[PDB]
């Protein structure tokens, strides 16, 4: 017998495609969810700032009543 290195009856194929998934969101959906979380942060920001101004006015009234 002979003992070279042949391929055994043929081998499987190997791909040659530029395999790209291009996944992720679109323009509109990513854009809208970013602006939506932005507006959520704005609303909570507005609420905290106006309640904070209430308390800071109370601090002003403390210094007024303390002064003379």
């Amino acid at each position: 017998v002979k003992q070279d290195m042949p391929p055994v009856g043929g081998y499987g194929p190997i791909d040659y495609k530029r395999n790209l998934p291009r996944r992720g969101l679109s323009g509109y959906s990513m854009f809208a969810v970013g602006i939506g979380a932005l507006l959520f942060g704005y609303w909570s920001m507005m609420r905290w700032n106006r309640e904070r101004r209430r308390l800071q006015i109370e601090d002003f009234e403390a210094r007024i009543a303390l002064m003379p």
Partner: protein, 54 residues
């Protein structure tokens, strides 16, 4: 098999990478007459114009 996957991952990393494309857009213009008279060969001729492969 492993190398087909790794060259796909290289094309994932670079190759539609924004800033590497922005680095290389329109640098190295080659006229086909300049490609012939200046004696460029191979991947230059493959990459600009002539359908020439040995």
């Amino acid at each position: 098999k492993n190398f087909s996957l790794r060259i796909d991952e290289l094309e994932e990393m670079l190759t539609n990478n924004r800033i590497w494309r922005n680095r290389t857009v329109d640098i190295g213009v080659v006229t086909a007459e300049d490609a012939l008279n200046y004696g460029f060969s191979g991947v230059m001729l493959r990459g600009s114009g002539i359908q020439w492969d040995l």
